[PDB]
Symmetry: C4
């Protein structure tokens, strides 16, 4: 699987997707003095950023653009362990490269904290991790339903629904933590700016919520017909 050319294109697609998502998402969330972005305006930038990249790079790599979604796909036996390892590595490397490019093009008077995720509105860490658990739970449920092969009778809008699911969470999670929903999106400006205050919330939150969202869909809500041998073959790099 690693030696495949299509796999290398998938890792680069995940690298490029997280690079563009962090570039277009964090840049629109900056504190622009002339026109301060609204919560809906930031929500649509993060929202349509995923929806654009799912349309653009969904047929190449699946367009996870998120370690949490990659972990959720790993728990749901949708991707291999080696593919999930390379996708997370590509997502984390692409995010930092996306935030470093944004930090290099934005004026110094405007970057500030580069839109790091921080506990806002006097929200404690206990409440913050609970929001991120539910913010990514609806994203993973919407992603698994949109990318479900059992629903081929109604293709629907896989790109927009997944994209609008990110916008839905940002209309809520901005008021608490800036709506992380993505460990790569949180680590991208934290590495550049050195602001790692309460950074465990944006990692434990989205990952646990994605695991619970994946276990709900694949084992409780809509269980597939895959056997134990079939699930182990997908995980351990067998075609």
């Amino acid at each position: 699987e690693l030696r495949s050319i299509a796999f290398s294109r998938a890792v680069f697609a995940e690298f490029l997707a997280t690079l563009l998502f962090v570039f277009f998402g964090l840049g629109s969330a900056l504190n622009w003095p002339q026109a301060l972005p609204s919560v809906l305006q930031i929500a649509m930038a993060f929202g349509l950023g995923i929806g654009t990249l799912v349309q653009a790079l969904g047929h190449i790599s699946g367009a996870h653009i998120n370690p949490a979604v990659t972990v959720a796909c790993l728990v749901g036996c949708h991707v291999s362990v080696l593919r999930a390892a390379f996708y997370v590595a590509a997502q984390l490397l692409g995010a930092v490269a996306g935030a470093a490019l944004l930090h290099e093009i934005t004026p110094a008077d405007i970057r500030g904290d580069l839109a790091v995720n921080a506990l806002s509105n006097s929200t404690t860490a206990g409440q913050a991790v609970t929001v991120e658990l539910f913010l990514t739970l609806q994203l993973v449920l919407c992603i698994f339903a949109s990318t479900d092969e059992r629903r081929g009778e109604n293709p629907g809008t896989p790109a927009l629904s997944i994209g609008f699911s990110v916008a839905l969470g940002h209309l809520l999670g901005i008021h608490y933590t800036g709506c992380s929903m993505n460990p790569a999106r949180s680590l991208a400006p934290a590495v550049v700016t050195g602001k790692f205050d309460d950074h465990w919330v944006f990692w434990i939150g989205p990952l646990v919520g994605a695991i619970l969202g994946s276990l709900l869909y694949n084992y409780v809500l809509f269980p597939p017909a895959k056997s134990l041998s079939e699930r182990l073959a997908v995980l351990k790099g067998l075609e």
Copy 2:
């Protein structure tokens, strides 16, 4: 039908859908001091919240996420009486659990009334119930058309159109009552906060509008070919 495993998954899906809809909808409608949500911003949160859950949980339970829509489907002979009973029970229980989770994670200085539906802009109860009758009439008409099996030639966007229909009503109903459109969404913060002022509007309004919307579609606009025996078989738990 009750003994079926797929039915139990449908009741849990309706429980989880109303839990997430109240969580993501009421939370974005709170009076955040730093960034007060606009009418469009609240509309898209309630709007894309339904659209996300219809994509996520439409193939499992139908994604009613509303007693009014469940009643409308019951009048239109789309669901059984026992399924409608369990869906409303799951919707009301999920909504209160969704509002209690939101009340426990939001700062005390920010919860306030937890975005209860109230008569705003000096609107009387008589005018308020008339808006909710039309707010849910367009939702039920859009839901029945999006989920119509006779329109298989053009699947369209069942998730987005239903979701955007909720956003359409919220661009109007926020100025009158906060745009209930859902007895579960109205009862969710009313139970927690104890604010039950003019609560009959948010129950009589959406239910009558959903009944009229269901009778318009199934008996006036687009009548199906189901006989009297077929309609009674669907209602009284017969497969």
Copy 3:
């Protein structure tokens, strides 16, 4: 054709569509003192109002919801003269009934002019009619493309694209005339409020733009294969 039951359902659908479009569109465009609607907020209400009704009532009557679109379909030989006569009559009657219902439910301190179309931003009548010509030209081009039977290979999003085309024009036409784009939507609050200042712009503008948009699509851009006898048969009530 008149004696057909499906035709009577189409006239009532056009009556109900324009009733709901005027109800949900004009109400969200009112001058609410606590939360004055933005240009985008009014655009999405008029925008998603058409998109909801096209999804809801497109398979019943075509969901013109506009005399201009009905005239455009009449020029393009898509509907009969008798169907276009009854659709415009249903649209004009539904619009006034929709605006009268909105005027009866809105507080007196809030109705004001009930969001009548008026020349705003010191725009003269000459410039105003030129905008409405282009506002409805893009709507008719998007409607004819979305409802084209030759494009069955790609159904796309007929409901959302038509709906978002109305939102596109409202992001421009609000600053000039309140973005009429619909003689029924303009006549609805003008009749109730008695404000008929420069009302010819909102009739000559959208009608000429729809005729030019229909002649562009059906005779210049994408001409069909219909003969002269086929076009006359569709117009003069022949099946």
Copy 4:
């Protein structure tokens, strides 16, 4: 190919698409004193303007509405050199005609600079061209994926995804350069108003980003099965 009637309809469609895109996009981006458009409001006008015209004129000319996308399609061997020459000529002529019509209908007190692209927020030319390189890279990647014939199993939403990709870039690029993303959209008000300050950014930026976006999709991400003779036949006007 030039003698074909369908080709002449494609050039007029590209002329009309860029005329309407500049008309509806620049007009909504003007400095209206009563209601100054937000960054999201301008983003949706430019965003839904492309999405409407892709739905309306995608089946006639491909709905490039952009020299950069036309160049990207030329590099990707999707259109001929003669078709790309005529599309750019139609796009540039339509844009100036679209901006001249908007300048003639807008009040003198409101036109101002007619929403020319300018370096805003103290952004230098070096940083500005880097944003436009990435703004058009995501547009070209989304356009090529939406119009890919290999993805016929999932048609998706070609009109909305391409349209929302333009809205995604405008949520970011407005704060830097007004989000050109289109040499025709930049040259349209620059010619009328005579404001050509740093105009090379809005030409070098989108063109290089479209070339890189086209080379990424067609040679790195999702290479097709076209041979060297097949690519040369498409480019040099051979059917």
